[PDB]
């Protein structure tokens, strides 16, 4: 490994994603294959490319060293194996969705999805999301309200 001069970058970089981010998910990759990463990188791909991460770090000692910053709801995620996912642009989006759909294709556990932060809380798969731009679901709420 590297000394501190390097354990600091994995911090100053990874924590300015939290400081400058959008949504957070969860997942434990016990059996995390590489067809695994391959896929989810195309997903990050659709979800821009390299706007997304997953930098395995669940050393509390790392991606909690980014938490007493923001998201101290994660002192509780960080135990055991974890795969932290941050969003920069994009809706508070679909990121959420396929992690459940992925891991529900066996694709290993999902930490039961211990969940995360947009609010400041816990678990439950939501597509309360990428409807986003479904302001059309407030366009159809126009003419249909005007007519009916």
């Amino acid at each position: 490994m590297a000394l501190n001069l390097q354990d600091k970058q994995a911090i100053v970089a990874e924590v300015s994603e939290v400081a400058k981010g959008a949504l957070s998910a969860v997942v434990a990759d016990s059996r995390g294959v590489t067809v695994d990463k391959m896929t989810e990188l195309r997903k990050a791909g659709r979800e821009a490319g390299v706007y997304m991460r997953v930098v395995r770090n669940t050393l509390l000692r790392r991606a909690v060293e980014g938490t007493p910053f923001e998201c101290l709801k994660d002192a509780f995620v960080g135990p055991t194996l974890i795969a932290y996912s941050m969003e920069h642009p994009g809706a508070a989006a679909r990121l959420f969705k396929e992690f459940a759909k992925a891991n529900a294709k066996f694709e290993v556990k999902a930490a039961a999805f211990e969940g995360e932060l947009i609010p400041a809380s816990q678990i439950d798969r939501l597509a309360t999301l990428p409807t986003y731009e479904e302001a059309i679901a407030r366009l159809m709420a126009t003419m249909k309200e005007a007519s009916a």
Partner: peptide, 30 residues
């Protein structure tokens, strides 16, 4: 209110205008 006076603007408008707006149209009614 005037329905045409709220269609001519309600088909043509910006973006982030809406993004910090229709996370809340859901609130007054629904």
């Amino acid at each position: 209110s005037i329905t045409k006076d709220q269609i001519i603007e309600a088909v043509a408008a910006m973006s982030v205008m809406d993004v910090v707006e229709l996370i809340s149209a859901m609130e007054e009614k629904f």
